[PDB]
Write a protein that binds this ligand. Structure first.
Ligand SMILES: O=S([O-])[O-]
Length: 292
């Protein structure tokens, strides 16, 4: 009956399907809700959503009103203790050896599997959640359905094959474009037949490309389509006002996509519930730029 999870800080034994789950990280609520586990607490990340559950996942709450935790002054260890959980899911929470001891003193705790304390590969997060809440087979079909949905996009748009994409943050950082590097977070673009432009590779800092101002134009001009994870029309305005972005062929040839807030959220969550939103709402935008 008992499930043993192996993670970065040891092993956690879950004796039976959990009844009172805390979602301690930024995104685990999506994968829990997907297998009909409503958390007694969800942790806010951004967007000021009600109960920190974004629209694609909100229906699964079934009217439930979880406590909303935050990481503004670290993990709210005392609030977690007061919720009396029987499982703490803390995969995307910045857990370290010390906070893991604090969480484990309250309840069986599932930490991240590796060197990413935040935003480990989404499928490894989804499979761990699936094991922990005794829904591994259901979670397997939900992962498969995301891959199927993006493959279906590719089947409808064979002309996209080998076109070059970049996935950028919705805001400059201290004057720099910030690109998502090729890795798990860009697999959904490869799934639709695109490639990630290699112009960002020399500018790596951990999992992102921080583009010096004197390289912004040449790096953006390598791509056929640019997806900016803007969260507001003000974000788009500030990107198009940047003198290097403004002077680029990406701007002259209208190769930019500026996401709605919901689409930015859906990419940011990269979950079994959020990726379908991306598969539905991004392709028609790409089609405007590359042609169907
Ligand atoms: O982790 S594999 O499923 O991409």
């Amino acid at each position: 009956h008992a499930v043993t999870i192996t993670h970065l800080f040891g092993q956690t034994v879950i004796k039976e399907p959990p009844k009172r789950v805390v979602s301690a990280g930024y995104t685990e609520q999506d994968d829990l809700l997907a297998v009909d586990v409503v958390p007694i607490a969800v942790t806010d990340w951004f967007g000021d959503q009600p109960f920190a559950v974004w629209p694609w996942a909100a229906p699964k709450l079934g009217g439930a009103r979880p406590a909303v935790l935050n990481l503004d002054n670290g993990i709210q260890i005392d609030r977690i203790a007061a919720l009396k959980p029987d499982l703490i899911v803390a995969i995307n929470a910045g857990v370290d050896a010390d906070t893991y001891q604090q969480l484990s003193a309250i309840a069986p705790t599932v930490a991240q599997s590796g060197g990413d304390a935040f935003f480990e590969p989404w499928k490894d997060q989804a499979r761990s959640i699936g094991q922990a809440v005794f829904a591994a087979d259901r979670m397997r079909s939900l992962i498969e359905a995301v891959d199927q949905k993006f493959a279906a996009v590719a089947q409808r748009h064979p002309r996209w094959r080998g076109k070059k994409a970049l996935l950028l943050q919705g805001r400059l950082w201290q004057g720099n474009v910030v690109a998502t590097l090729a890795g798990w977070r860009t697999d959904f673009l490869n799934d639709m037949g695109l490639v990630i432009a290699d112009s960002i590779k020399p500018f790596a800092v951990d999992q992102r490309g921080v583009i010096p101002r004197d390289h912004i134009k040449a790096v953006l001009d390598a791509a056929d389509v640019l997806i900016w994870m803007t969260e507001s029309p003000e974000d788009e305005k500030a990107l198009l006002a940047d003198p290097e972005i403004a002077a680029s062929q990406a701007t002259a040839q209208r190769r930019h996509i500026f996401t709605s807030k919901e689409q930015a959220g859906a990419i940011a969550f990269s979950s079994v519930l959020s990726y379908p939103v991306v598969a539905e709402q991004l392709p028609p935008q790409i089609s405007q730029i590359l042609g169907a």
